[PDB]
């Protein structure tokens, strides 16, 4: 039953990797809007 | 660059047995993508030719940070990189606002740094006993390289040129690296490691799958066709040999290949010399192609590990040579057991056997056959004398 | 010309040797079959490096568990920043 | 101009190398550091330092924390009573620790290294040695001298050279005292200060049969405790030598000849 628990933990890791991909696209959007902020300020 | 505030605390990893004995025991620093410590500066502000020098210097700095396995400001770790996972794929994301030529140079240097990190984790994991001390030696040698060739040349050339050399260009840095050829050596070693890992995978594929002359001989000899998931013993050296067969034409390549091959197989040829001159069996890592039971009451069955062989032993001549060497070792062990002696001194006969120094020369040359025939005749002489007179 | 006939002495010595070999192989297979093939079903273990327990995996699980939360937390923060900067 | 000027405004809020060294001296010495508030387990590094510099200082403070944890472990093991072989093992560990201490003191006083990369490359051997010693002390409080020597002989077969060397040193330091016990038992029949690490033991547990040992000869020969580097016949011969010596000295009263 330990292998099933490890598989469930790997599924949780996959879900968190999906959240990390969401974080990465959020980060690229943040970089784009930071460039926009710097362009509109200067 | 505005300093961003994150809680950076270094602690020793509490459990280390799941970490190789040569693996790192500290937590990794936070990631720029996750917890940046400095506010990044946009490269398009310095992508102009007048500010191209600032961008080039920052790129060279980030590349020097990558070459040792650390992240910078513009070339950050990839999305799948996990600093707490030793087996996760380690890629990098280069800033999109970088100069194209600078982007190609940074791609080359980040490939070099990634190969460095991959080989680092490789020899770290290879510090385990499951890979065999031989491979461990190789691992050691790898680290030796990274401790004497890669890091030394890096710190001596690239850091100094980036610090105290004006008019320095990333093209000049790449040309200097190509002059050092440490990048080419790392590329070839990475190809070797990829081939080794693919061989491990192929050994993992065949999970279910794995002569009358033995019955003709009055010997309790058996075969051991057990294949290991990782190459061990001669199966490693053969790869090196095969690499020597694939690196012909380049003198330095074959030179370094035979150098590492001898440095690693010193232990194996020492063990083989011990087996052929004393019959002493000592294989705590299952790297020698000969082992027996009782480690029927007096008779022990010898098993020949097919995975760690030195040759294919498919031809009749090769099979007879293997049988002769095994019989020599068995007779030596029998003489030691009968005489109650720990070792057999060389003065027991008029025949002496010298230790092997170069494994490649012993393989390509017949001096191996000379030694084998000499020790076989010596053992036959001693055994016949002890049985006809004792 | 014509294909040469196989020698008489040759076939005689061959049938003699073949009879002897058949008898010898039958007798050898009858005498317990000294020929054998085995498979290695044993491995060495060295206590100091030999793991006392693999439970560290679940430990690592817990570790990764914590890391998971951190990621989520970081994600939230980034969102805020984004939204914040968006308002700007 | 120099490249330092191009990146000057980027790191105006960073700590120079001078204070970095001045405070890593305190941090690695297990002492407090004002620039880096040092907890017993956490270095608590400020975020002003870049992340790659953060990683290199993480490695440096990892070496320092390994030194501090080895000091804690050696203090703990010195406070506890152990066998003389374990005492010599602790002595070897303390020798390694003080050698590394003198090494880092020479590095601090001299300060010839200018690039932290070359500094780490120089100290990498000592870092690996300290890591090996921590890996060893992880299970030191559990194993006995026999398992100690087993693992030492195992690591002497290891493909690496430093592990093999350390294992050989510890094996020699323990086999010295083992031979001392052997000589004591062979010269005076004494099981003194053996700590159960000797294959011959004294068994005075009598169940009424010859309580005065008129014929019992309360000496036991443990075959399982006989190491591999000694034959069972030779161990039995040693046992009989000691038993006959005690028999002559106690029963036959041949004090002068036995002496």
Numbering used by the authors:
A (entry chain Sc): 164 to 205
B (entry chain E): 1 to 210, 222 to 306, 318 to 412
C (entry chain Sd): 112 to 199
D (entry chain F): 165 to 423
Verbatim from the authors:
Microtubule (MT) filaments, composed of α/β-tubulin dimers, are fundamental to cellular architecture, function and organismal development. They are nucleated from MT organizing centers by the evolutionarily conserved γ-tubulin ring complex (γTuRC). S. cerevisiae γTuRC is built from a helical repeat of seven ‘V’-shaped copies of the tetrameric γ-tubulin small complex (γTuSC), composed of Spc97/GCP2 (SPB component 97/γ-tubulin complex 2) and Spc98/GCP3 subunits each bound to a γ-tubulin molecule. Here we used cryo-electron tomography to determine the structure of the native γTuRC capping the minus end of a MT in the context of enriched budding yeast spindles.
